Structures are given as C-alpha cells and as structure tokens.
C-alpha cells in the first residue's frame, strides 16, 4: 500500500452487443435447425437413459 494504489473498474453494454452476443451464445448452446439432437435423445431414452435409470434405482 505504500506509494501505491488502484482504481475501480466498470463495463459498458448497448442493445446491439447484448442481443447479438445473447443470440450467439444461445445458439452456441443450441443446434443449427434445433430439431436435430432433440429427437436423438428422445429415441435414446429407450437405450441410454434406461441404463442410467437402472443405476439411479
């Protein structure tokens, strides 16, 4: 602390960056057509998930 100190830090965001980055991140957590990998797990419920349900039991 002797002969030394610091300064506060804040950010700034507008609507463009907000909407763009939010949509891009949501899409990053989503699929291209979004209907692709859903039905996959839906049909994997009778194969994969079942074993996980057995282990859960």
């Amino acid at each position: 602390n002797r002969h030394y100190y610091s300064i506060t830090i804040n950010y700034r965001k507008n609507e463009l960056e907000q909407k763009m980055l939010l949509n891009l991140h949501k899409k990053s957590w989503m699929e291209g057509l979004t209907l692709q990998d859903y039905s996959e797990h839906c049909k994997h419920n009778e194969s994969v998930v079942k074993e996980m349900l057995e282990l859960a039991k």
């Binding site: 980055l21 949509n23 991140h25 057509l33």
Partner: protein, 286 residues
C-alpha cells in the same frame, strides 16, 4: 475435405466492432475482412482476425477494393507475434450473395490456398445460426453447364477454448447453462416450435414464389430430392409402432412409480416434523 469447422464468437464481436466504429457514415455497405485460422489440422479453428477497408460502387457491382500491402503487413506482424495461426479465407457482413464475390475470392484463390466464405447479417434479428461456412470448390455439373465456382454449405459450431467462456459468462450474467431440469428443458420444448415456424415460413414462401415465378436455372434438380425427402414419410399409420408406443408408455409408468415412491419417501421427514416439532413447541411454549 473439411467436414466441419469451429467459429469463435470473437470474430463476430469484431463485426460488432465494425458496427461500432462506423460513427454514422450514411453508407454502411458490405465490409470485407480477413479471417485467420489453422488450415493445418483437418478441422478448422478460428482464433482471431483483423480488418481491411472495403468499398464498392453504387451502380456497377463489379467494383471491389482490397489492399495487398496492408494485408501483407498485418499478416506479417501477426505471424511475427504468433506463428501458430495463418491465413485461411475472408468473410462479409452482407445478407445477400453478390455475383462479384467470385472475383473477390479469386484473389485469395490465387495468392492463398482455397478460402472459406462466411455470410452473416448486419442486424442480429435472425434467430437461426448467424454463421454459415461455405467452402469454395469446383464441382462437375450434371446439366452440363460450364464449370464455375460453387459454394457448398459446411456445418459449423459456436464454441470457445478456455477463458473466452469465462469472459462471456461474466459479461452476460443473464444466460444459463444446460442445467438439466424442468424450466431449462420446457423452455426449449416451447420456443423450438417457433424456431421451426419462423424459419419454415421465411423459407417455403420465397421457395414457392421463386419456383413458379422465376428463372436463372439454379439447378432445381436437388429440390426434387427435397420433395422426395418430404415424401419419405407417407403418413405412417403407427400400427407397427404401437408396440413402441407401449414400451414408451411403459417407461412413462416407470417414471410414475419412481416419482410417487421417491416423493413418498421425502414426505416422511415432513409429515413427522410437522407434528413432533409443533406439538413440542406448543407444549413448551407456556
């Protein structure tokens, strides 16, 4: 050649910077930048990039302006500081594909290796994936049309390496992770219908219009295979799938049993404490 590519949000945020430093011009046409990545590995990986001035003409569409010196300087310094990344291709922010783009890409087709083209939107009103990776190759046409540059769609994914995830998550503090549960899943199960709705509505209308009302033989032949895919499901009566529905509903019954039993187990402590704690508190109250 390349099955899939990896596009980091940093370049699109650099496009956000392109929409930032504009400073109210009154022109705001398409801007061609230079994308950088690693062409060594089979899968393409985007790290960072820079920006080069690009201008066109109002009337004549054949006008395109690039810079060799600025490109060699920027890529030179970038290669000087980081040797783990080289040139790959370019991208534009234009929503529409211009005919001059083949001549624009021809330069990097000569000087550099084969370049990948990326098309995005100036206004992020598109719910779908903003980034479309288009490889530039020469394919033999079935109709017999002269050989020309053809853009083929390549699947892509939006992801980050290590720190970028942290930076995004910190700068947002809004979006949520996968978080397996009720709300996270049901939100998808709700909005996905709209995700297909707006897209299909935006597509099949212009499709239906341009098919009958239009010209410039873009090789409709693939659309017969489209309609064929639409005909791959000739209204199945589910009669064969009845057993599958029975198994699925049986699994549903399993879920019912599990839920009821587990909740019955949880109810123990509650329906004990609600009595034993209240009666003791009441008797020791006075």
């Amino acid at each position: 050649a390349v099955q899939k590519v990896v596009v980091h949000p940093l370049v699109l945020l650099s496009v956000v910077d392109h929409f930032n430093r504009i400073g109210k011009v009154g022109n705001q046409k398409r801007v061609v930048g230079v994308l950088l990545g690693s062409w060594q590995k089979k899968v393409l990986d985007v790290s960072n990039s820079f920006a080069v001035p690009f201008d066109e003409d109002d009337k004549d569409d054949s006008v395109w302006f690039l810079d060799h010196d600025y490109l060699e300087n920027m890529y030179g310094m970038f290669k000087k500081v980081n040797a783990r990344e080289r040139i790959v291709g370019w991208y534009h922010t234009g929503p529409k594909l211009h005919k001059n783009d083949i001549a624009i890409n021809e330069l990097m087709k000569r000087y550099c290796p084969n370049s990948v083209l990326v098309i995005i939107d100036v206004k992020p009103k598109d719910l779908g994936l903003p980034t479309e990776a288009y490889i530039s190759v020469e394919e033999v046409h079935d109709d017999g049309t002269p050989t020309s540059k053809t853009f083929e769609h390549v699947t892509s994914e939006i992801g980050a390496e290590e720190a970028e995830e942290v930076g995004v998550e910190h700068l947002l503090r809004d979006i949520k992770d996968t978080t397996v549960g009720t709300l996270s899943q049901r939100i998808t199960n709700q909005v996905h219908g709209l995700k297909g709705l707006n897209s299909k509505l935006l597509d099949i209308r212009s499709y239906l219009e341009k098919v009958a009302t239009g010209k410039l033989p873009i090789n409709h032949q693939i659309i017969y295979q489209l309609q064929d895919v639409f005909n791959l499901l000739p209204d199945v009566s589910l009669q064969e799938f009845v057993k599958a529905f029975y198994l699925k509903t049986n699994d549903q019954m399993v879920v019912v049993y599990l839920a009821s039993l587990i909740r019955s187990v949880v109810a123990l402590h509650n329906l004990i404490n609600n009595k034993i704690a209240n009666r003791d508190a009441e008797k020791k109250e006075g």
